[PDB]
């Protein structure tokens, strides 16, 4: 993950991961994701745009909006400044994948299981940031708004699902967990992108 | 207008009750969301809602199976052209005539919306904060 470390502006690694903690995910996620945990830890990367989070702290809320077959497990590992969620899905029938859950628009997108390309290439590619993650307004929002801390995000008030307009005027720094919980209770099921 | 109560009420789910501070923050969120809605005209709330329904849309295993195959093909381009436009990559992947091409290509807010539509310059008037269900 030399590329990830070189291309992330103003990285802050807030903490390393306990090894005993991440090794209970041995059979749930890829070796690649585990290596990324050891490198990235808990932190804020790419000039504040992405955060690596404690998976079990996001486990319940992803199972709340991401429907799964009984042979699937989902492990959250990264979020956007908006509270969008990246998670690794273990799937024993068709093989693994990553799901990008856009909390603003109520969609999920099936991404490749390959964490190496996602994190060294995809999140630095401007058109993926725009077309996959709808993150293109970030540099514009971040000149007018402070940086959310790792337990905060740019929330829309009101939420876009709740009829809010998508503009910088409706953005507030809110605590991420009750926000995401409220947005999900406002929306039906996630829609496939 | 007439006061539209969110149906069903929001929940304070049991998993989040072990933390005594969560409910407080939830209530704060629900209140700030409610004021944000009530600050809108009915027209613009309906405008945004129908705009929102435009994003996103069978058997999920079959769709994910196809998407996995497609994503492996997309990955081959990303490895070679790190800064290439992903729409171009996707179009080239989706244009191949073999491989991928063998695989056939296959609500709390909505309730407020439906109650409002049968109610029909004028401001939205909803209540989100009452009747938080505990457990």
Angstrom distance (rounded) from CA A128 to CA B72? 16
Distance from CA of A142 to the nearest CA of B (A): 22
Per the CB < 8 Å rule, is A178 touching B29?
Answer: yes
The H-or-E segment that residue B5 falls in is strand B4-5
Chain A residues close to B108, C-beta within 8 Å: 185-187
How is A122-185 classified by DSSP, letter by letter? Answer: GGG-HHHHHHTT--TTHHHHHHHSPPPPTTEEEEESS-GGGT---SGGGEEEEEHHHHHHHHHH
Closest CA to A82 of A10, A191, A182, A174: A174
Chain A residues close to B125, C-beta within 8 Å: none
* Phi, psi for A174 (deg, rounded to 5): -125, 160
CB A81 within 8 A of CB A177: no
For residue A190, what is the DSSP state? P
Stated in angstroms to one decimal place, the resolution of this structure is 2.2
Closest residue of A to B64, CA-based?
A110
Closest CA to A84 of A35, A148, A3, A15: A148
Angstrom distance (rounded) from CA A88 to CA B122? 45
Kindly calculate the radius of gyration of chain B based on its CA atoms and give it in whole angstroms. 23
Cα dihedral angle (B7, B8, B10, B12), rounded to 10 degrees? 170
For A21, the domain range is 2-192
Among A60, A174, A186, the residue with its CB nearest the CB of B15 is: A60
Around Cβ B5, how many Cβ atoms within 10 Å? 14
Angstrom distance (rounded) from CA A80 to CA A154? 9
Among A60, A113, A178, the residue with its CB nearest the CB of B26 is: A178
The H-or-E segment that residue A192 falls in is strand A191-192
Around Cβ B81, how many Cβ atoms within 10 Å? 13
CB B57 within 8 A of CB A191: yes
Distance from CA of B34 to the nearest CA of A (A): 7
> Which CA distances in Å does B49 have to A169, B64, B116, B129?
18, 28, 12, 21
Angstrom distance (rounded) from CA A129 to CA A147? 19
Cβ pairs A/B, distance under 8 A: 134
Closest residue of B to A59, CA-based?
B15
Number of structural domains found in chain A: 1
Closest CA to A50 of A11, A9, A79: A79
Q: Residues with Cβ < 8 Å from B64, sequence gap 6 or more?
A: A91, A94, A97, A110
Angstrom distance (rounded) from CA B113 to CA B95? 41
Q: Residues with Cβ < 8 Å from A18, sequence gap 6 or more?
A: none
Closest residue of B to A107, CA-based?
B56
Strand A152-156 and strand A107-111: the pairing is unpaired
Cα dihedral angle (A51, A119, B106, B59), rounded to 10 degrees? -60
Per the CB < 8 Å rule, is A185 touching B65?
Answer: no
Around Cβ A18, how many Cβ atoms within 10 Å? 9
Lookup result for tokens 């909505």:
B110
Distance from CA of A124 to the nearest CA of B (A): 8
Among A97, A164, A186, the residue with its CB nearest the CB of B64 is: A97
Distance from CA of A38 to the nearest CA of B (A): 23
Per the CB < 8 Å rule, is B55 touching A112?
Answer: no
In A50-190, at which residue ranges do the beta strands (DSSP E only) sit? 50-52, 72-80, 85-91, 97-102, 107-111, 152-156, 171-175
For residue A66, what is the DSSP state? -
Give start and end residues of each alpha helix (H) in chain B: 20-38, 42-52, 60-80, 86-95, 108-118
Closest residue of B to A160, CA-based?
B52
Lookup result for tokens 């990008």:
A100
Per the CB < 8 Å rule, is A125 touching B74?
Answer: no
Angstrom distance (rounded) from CA B126 to CA A99? 33
Q: Indicate which technique resolved this structure.
A: X-ray
For residue A49, what is the DSSP state? T
Retrieve residue B57's tokens: 């849309």
């Amino acid at each position: 993950f030399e590329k990830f470390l070189e291309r992330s502006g103003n990285s802050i690694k807030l903490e390393e991961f306990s090894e005993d903690y991440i090794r209970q995910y041995n059979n749930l996620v890829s070796e690649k994701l585990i290596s990324f945990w050891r490198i990235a830890g808990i932190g804020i990367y790419c000039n504040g745009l992405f955060r690596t989070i404690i998976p079990n702290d996001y486990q319940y809320i992803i199972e709340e909006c991401y429907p799964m077959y009984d042979y699937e497990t989902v492990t959250p590992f990264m979020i956007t400044v908006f509270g969008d969620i990246f998670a690794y899905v273990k799937n024993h029938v068709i093989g693994d994948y990553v799901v990008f859950i856009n909390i603003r628009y109520g969609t999920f997108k099936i991404l490749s299981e390959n964490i190496d390309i996602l994190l060294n290439i995809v999140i630095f590619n401007k058109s993926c940031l725009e077309n996959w993650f709808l993150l293109n307004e970030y540099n514009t929002i971040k000149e007018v708004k402070a940086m959310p801390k790792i337990d905060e995000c740019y929330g829309y008030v009101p939420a876009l699902v709740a009829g809010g307009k998508d503009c910088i005027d409706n953005i507030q720094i809110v605590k991420i967990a009750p926000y995401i919980d409220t947005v999900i209770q406002l929306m039906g099921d996630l829609k496939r992108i | 207008l007439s006061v539209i109560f969110v149906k069903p009420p929001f929940q304070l789910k049991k998993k989040f009750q072990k933390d005594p501070f969560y409910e407080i923050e939830m209530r704060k969120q629900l209140q700030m969301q409610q004021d944000g809605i009530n600050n809108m005209t009915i027209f613009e709330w309906l405008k945004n809602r129908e705009n929102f329904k435009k994003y996103g849309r069978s058997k999920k295993i079959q769709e994910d199976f196809r998407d996995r195959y497609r994503n492996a093909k997309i990955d081959e381009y990303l490895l070679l052209y790190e800064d290439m436009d992903i729409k171009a990559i996707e179009a080239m992947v989706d244009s191949e005539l073999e491989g991928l091409a063998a695989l056939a290509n296959p609500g709390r807010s909505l309730n407020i919306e439906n109650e409002l539509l049968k109610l029909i310059k004028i401001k939205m008037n909803v209540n989100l904060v009452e009747n938080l269900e505990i457990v």
